[PDB]
């Protein structure tokens, strides 16, 4: 009886950032509610001002990471205000049926739904909106998040030892297809619909013209980079819900990997980069050992430094010169 | 002394079905006699009625799926008939040597041959045509399909514990590169010695116009959805000859999957998606836990609903309202 | 004290070949002193006599690779003579702070600098320079190479026992992006400068316009082949510093494959393909069992014998029928 079950409201925050949570479990098995909130939004994803007719779950790009425990109820409150001009609904990986819930989600503008499922599989999974017809549309106008379950007893080593983070972001990867005219310019659109040929037109070349994290090009950099202390254990929870990409901390690794999320598989050690497919999240475990500024990039170098993808960690604390040093600094002989 | 060994000859199957076999070898090593005849033919290949030359292993796209245990030979005749126009070959990845075969095959029109190599490694493999000079046009025309050299003990989980498929399916995952003009219209060609130059910048191009599983667009849909009933577990073989895939039930998961297909390693547990790079074949298994209409498809989004790269699998049995539920059903408040 | 370390130079060589060292350390650690020197040049990279001017670390593309054991220290001294008219500086996958070194080892054109870390993780991992603001730009101009840092004891199989390679050889394999006008041909620059806005352009492709082995296509072939004898036990180290990757050796196999590099973790086992994602190296063993010709190619087929990215092996030795054979050889009946 999931009426018997301890239930918990969850209010969720905008990514980078995670919601607090515990990753050992204090608590049996519980039903676990969240609320999200439909925005159809004007959003200026790069350093050009180019301005996109975005979609987006709870006002951000990617939506924001839920996080529970294996064998929790997710309970979601989905709500499509008649702001709202599309018709949408959720599929999330974590779940078994109905299309990941997407059968059983459909809103229009002005109605709201609520789904249940059992998270029984423990990892990092993508959700997304996916509306029959429609679905990479929705998809790559920035209707995605992701969702972490994590094992009850927490994370563990490639030797079944424990594993815990002190800190955890999320980023959201992002590839956009602004549609082009001949001379290579971004054209621009009135409503949706007057919109949907040529957004199809521009996703099937399969080159985006964007790629970025946390919703734009330099969002994670600046006042807004992300930040650590030498010493410190951070996971970096990745998604990806449509392309391909391989993250890198450029100065650093993953320590521990689970590049395709699961965290019943052990996790790969000391990767310089890892793949995380199209579809999916992947989680990465770092201790910090050197303080400074490190870039954090998709390691397609084209795709972090000219289309986007390509944040930043400050990191705080003392320099190890054992482990790196200038022995002769630049100079002409 | 090979020819002091059984032999048995398989008839073919068209996929995604697979012709009958064991899992368990209940024989000793054998040698396995397989036909295939070279088949060039027109296919339309999706809903606009785009007609393409294809060449074909046996008359489908992908070629049929020839399933072995470790340390048999196989043994194919291959027959190209003076019907058809081109020289082919066969190049089996599960082969050592001799370009796995493809330096031993060479048939014009009008000609055939026997192939004999032993199945020293288990997984499943990939193998296509590849003729000199010429091989990304016959394997992009359709030429490939896969083998699966099982072990002869079986199928074995991360622990070592038998796992027993109840049903097996292949999809062969296809990209096409239709000559386009300046317009961006399909280019159409009277012969193939026509077509050649203009397929070959198609190609380079590294863009398909289409992505298909079984040959067409819809073609694992409908009448020929894929079908399992609640509490089965199926495999699905899938192979992608030249260019990396990421498939994934939508509504499911693969519980245990062999991403790059070779079953000496351990399974990934539980995975979303998972990655196949180009040229090679991958297995998943999974045991289905709700009825309906599941949808499987590369996950590059585009590529699954704008290029063709999507079937169906259409699931009996009782719906788990504890696995998922509709709390409250779509509607205005 | 590092003072207190033994040093010891070591002289690179020219891709394919790799510096002489030993498997298994034959002393405590070290300070390995290695030094390149920085070389803009013209190259030719094609059979057509396209030229472009390359950017390489010692006068190749890739960059040679470095082969340490683990906690060495690597001490490079980077020469950037004042012929060259470009900012440089390294970026190490395999060190740990300031972004990888590049942070440290800026040169102007008639500088140097000496760079020290300490090779804390066993694997193959790529080195590649990293300008600020131009980071692409210079490694898809062949600024890329790798470093292997062993095992103390050397590289071990899946159970943990010894593997030892005969033979060793770096593949680089480097996707550049030679800019092109409306007609489509590859367009001419008198200057880096001039090029800069148009390489950039033809980089936002995401498309390759050659993608080639050790610099140039049939730089691996011919009396430039690389060698085996049967029986004999060989690792091939692949990198690729930007873009994905799916090697594949025809007629033969990965026996022991790191597919992103890392010796920590288990080898894959009898791999056909393994990708090889951008910004990472990985590593391949396999024990030739037939003799002749096999190419060695990225099975994107059409990378591979339309961009460029194929090489051969020839390999002498016995035939093994048991293995392969042709039954009938090819006919008319
Ligand atoms: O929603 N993609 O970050
Ligand atoms: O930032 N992408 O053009
Ligand atoms: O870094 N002092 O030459
Ligand atoms: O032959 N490709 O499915
Ligand atoms: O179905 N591909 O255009
Ligand atoms: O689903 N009943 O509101
Ligand atoms: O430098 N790339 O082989
Ligand atoms: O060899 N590439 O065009
Ligand atoms: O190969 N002799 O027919
Ligand atoms: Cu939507
Ligand atoms: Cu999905
Ligand atoms: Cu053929
Ligand atoms: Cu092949
Ligand atoms: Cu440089
Ligand atoms: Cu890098």
Same mark, same amino acid.
């Given at each position: 009886?999931?009426?018997?079950?301890?239930?918990?409201?969850?209010?969720?925050?905008?990514?980078?950032?995670?919601?607090?949570?515990?990753?050992?479990?204090?608590?049996?098995?519980?039903?676990?509610?969240?609320?999200?909130?439909?925005?159809?939004?004007?959003?200026?994803?790069?350093?050009?001002?180019?301005?996109?007719?975005?979609?987006?779950?709870?006002?951000?790009?990617?939506?924001?990471?839920?996080?529970?425990?294996?064998?929790?109820?997710?309970?979601?409150?989905?709500?499509?205000?008649?702001?709202?001009?599309?018709?949408?609904? =959720?599929? +999330?990986?974590? $779940?078994? /049926? #109905? @299309?990941? *819930?997407?059968?059983?989600?459909?809103?229009?503008? %002005? !109605?709201?739904?609520?789904?249940?499922?059992?998270?029984?599989?423990?990892?990092?999974?993508?959700?997304?909106?996916?509306?029959?017809?429609?679905?990479?549309?929705?998809?790559?106008?920035?209707?995605?998040?992701?969702?972490?379950?994590?094992?009850?007893?927490?994370?563990?080593?490639?030797?079944?030892?424990?594993?815990?983070?002190?800190?955890?972001?999320?980023?959201?990867?992002?590839?956009?297809?602004?549609?082009?005219?001949?001379?290579?310019?971004?054209?621009?659109?009135?409503?949706?619909?007057?919109?949907?040929?040529?957004?199809?037109?521009?996703?099937?070349?399969?080159?985006?013209?964007? =790629?970025? +994290?946390?919703? $734009?090009? /330099? #969002? @994670?950099? *600046?006042?807004?980079?992300?930040?650590?202390?030498? %010493? !410190?254990?951070?996971?970096?929870?990745?998604?990806?819900?449509?392309?391909?990409?391989?993250?890198?901390?450029?100065?650093?690794?993953?320590?521990?990997?689970?590049?395709?999320?699961?965290?019943?598989?052990?996790?790969?050690?000391?990767?310089?980069?890892?793949?995380?497919?199209?579809?999916?999240?992947?989680?990465?475990?770092?201790?910090?050992?050197?303080?400074?500024?490190?870039?954090?990039?998709?390691?397609?170098?084209?795709?972090?430094?000219?289309?986007?993808?390509?944040?930043?960690?400050?990191?705080?604390?003392?320099?190890?010169?054992?482990?790196?040093?200038?022995?002769?600094?630049?100079?002409?002989?």
């Amino acid at each position: 009886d999931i009426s018997t079950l301890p239930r918990v409201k969850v209010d969720l925050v905008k990514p980078p950032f995670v919601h607090a949570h515990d990753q050992v479990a204090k608590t049996g098995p519980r039903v676990v509610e969240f609320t999200m909130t439909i925005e159809e939004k004007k959003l200026v994803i790069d350093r050009e001002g180019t301005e996109i007719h975005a979609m987006t779950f709870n006002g951000s790009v990617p939506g924001p990471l839920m996080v529970v425990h294996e064998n929790d109820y997710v309970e979601l409150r989905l709500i499509n205000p008649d702001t709202n001009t599309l018709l949408h609904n =959720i599929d +999330f990986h974590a $779940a078994t /049926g #109905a @299309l990941g *819930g997407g059968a059983l989600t459909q809103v229009n503008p %002005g !109605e709201e739904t609520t789904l249940r499922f059992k998270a029984t599989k423990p990892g990092v999974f993508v959700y997304h909106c996916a509306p029959e017809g429609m679905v990479p549309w929705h998809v790559t106008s920035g209707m995605n998040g992701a969702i972490m379950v994590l094992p009850r007893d927490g994370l563990k080593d490639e030797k079944g030892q424990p594993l815990t983070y002190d800190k955890i972001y999320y980023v959201g990867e992002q590839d956009f297809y602004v549609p082009k005219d001949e001379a290579g310019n971004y054209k621009k659109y009135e409503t949706p619909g007057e919109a949907y040929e040529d957004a199809v037109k521009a996703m099937r070349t399969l080159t985006p013209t964007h =790629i970025v +994290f946390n919703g $734009a090009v /330099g #969002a @994670l950099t *600046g006042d807004h980079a992300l930040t650590a202390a030498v %010493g !410190e254990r951070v996971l970096v929870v990745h998604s990806q819900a449509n392309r391909d990409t391989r993250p890198h901390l450029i100065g650093g690794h993953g320590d521990y990997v689970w590049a395709t999320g699961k965290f019943r598989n052990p996790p790969d050690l000391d990767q310089e980069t890892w793949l995380i497919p199209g579809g999916t999240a992947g989680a990465a475990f770092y201790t910090f050992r050197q303080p400074g500024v490190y870039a954090y990039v998709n390691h397609n170098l084209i795709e972090a430094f000219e289309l986007g993808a390509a944040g930043h960690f400050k990191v705080t604390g003392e320099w190890n010169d054992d482990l790196m040093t200038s022995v002769v600094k630049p100079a002409s002989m």
